[PDB]
Amino acid sequence: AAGPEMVRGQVFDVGPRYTNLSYIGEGAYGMVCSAYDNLNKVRVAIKKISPFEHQTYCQRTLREIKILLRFRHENIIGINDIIRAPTIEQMKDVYIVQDLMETDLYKLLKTQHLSNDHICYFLYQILRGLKYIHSANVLHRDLKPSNLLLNTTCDLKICDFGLARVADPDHDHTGFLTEYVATRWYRAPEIMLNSKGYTKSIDIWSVGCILAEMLSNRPIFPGKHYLDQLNHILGILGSPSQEDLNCIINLKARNYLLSLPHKNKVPWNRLFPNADSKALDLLDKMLTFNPHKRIEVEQALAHPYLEQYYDPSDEPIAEAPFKFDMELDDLPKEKLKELIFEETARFQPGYRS
């Protein structure tokens, strides 16, 4: 319009550079639109974020911005531009511009039965991108089909780092990590048992849930709640071995698991009779109840199922991994607004340097 462009009666003030707005859904803190970038001459995705009234919204917005701003990887969504008011008082919204991806795995699996070549290629990309995330000491914490973007030529990109976080190995996090992380159906066992002291292996589990879903077009553990989710897991994996119950540091947690009826391990080839044998082996290694025995991203890439893509020299790691200085963000929302104002300044029109 004359002033800011509107969409659904809402202001979507993306200056003159981005035009031809089209609503494409809801983000956690605002709607998302696709627009035509008049400079780059392509359509992009722009998400409006209004987190300033809440502390956790600000903490999560700052995190995604700082993480994605340092990350440079083919299998990870990047930030192309950031639009916001010239002065901090005027800043109520922040617009993050990213590549417009044709679809995502959640939407694809909804209408498509994947060929083994596609499953293999998609798994390789998730892991190649996950290796990088992990080498930077970052935990994504919300890996799932909808968070795996896809373009018209099978390129996959991991997105939505709002629930992501830095965890420097140099420090002990046991008891300080946020508790209710990840989407339920893709939540590793330990997020319930060892609630505040989990690790980056929770991402490998999530990837395992995505592999299983890619093979059957159905979520492997569609739990209805926190406990049922656990039973869904043990109904297929079977009751935990003795050395696993023991590795569960929480007393009451370990007690609950023990006071549960016995269940046999449902063989993988019973659930996926059609699936490739190697895929089922790697799957087995990814959906391991014990986080210490679970396969790691570098080993998962080296597994035989991905042997035709595996190439450690073309699977890069973070040049500059994140440290503890990145975990000093449990600040007041006022301070966080200042940090978000500073991080985005470099995208301001005319910014020198």
Which residues are annotated as catalytic? 142
State yes or no: 32 annotated in a binding site: yes
State yes or no: 129 annotated in a binding site: no
Phi, psi (rounded to 5 degrees) for 121 = -70, -40
State yes or no: 78 annotated in a binding site: no
How far apart are alpha carbons 78 and 70 in whole angstroms? 9
Which whole-number Å values give the CA distances from 89 to 115, 192, 246, 314, 342, in the listed order?
Answer: 52, 41, 54, 45, 13
Say which residues have a Cβ less than 8 Å from residue 244's Cβ, sequence separation at least 6.
289, 290
| Encoded tokens for 26 | 């809801």
**How many C-beta atoms lie closer than 10 Å to residue 258's C-beta?**
11
Beta-bridge mates of residue 45: 34, 98
Q: Is 293 left (phi over 0), alpha (psi -120 to 50) or beta?
A: alpha
State yes or no: 179 annotated in a binding site: no
Residue the block writes with tokens 């370990």: 254
State yes or no: 24 annotated in a binding site: yes
Cα radius of gyration (the chain): 21
Q: Please, is 16 exposed, middle or buried when counting C-beta atoms within 10 Å of its C-beta (0-12, 13-18, 19+)?
A: exposed
State yes or no: 107 annotated in a binding site: no
State yes or no: 101 annotated in a binding site: no
Residue the block writes with tokens 């700052």: 62
State yes or no: 25 annotated in a binding site: yes
| Encoded tokens for 39 | 């400079």
> At residue 250, what is the residue type?
N
How far apart are alpha carbons 117 and 127 in whole angstroms? 16
- After which residues does the chain break, using C–N > 2.5 Å? none
Q: Is the dihedral of CA 121, 206, 44, 79 positive or negative?
A: negative
State the Cα angle at 295 between 293 and 297, rounded to 5°.
145
> DSSP states of 84-123 as a string?
--SSTTT---EEEEEE--SEEHHHHTTT----HHHHHHHH
Annotated binding site: 24-32, 47
Annotated binding site for ATP: 24-32, 47
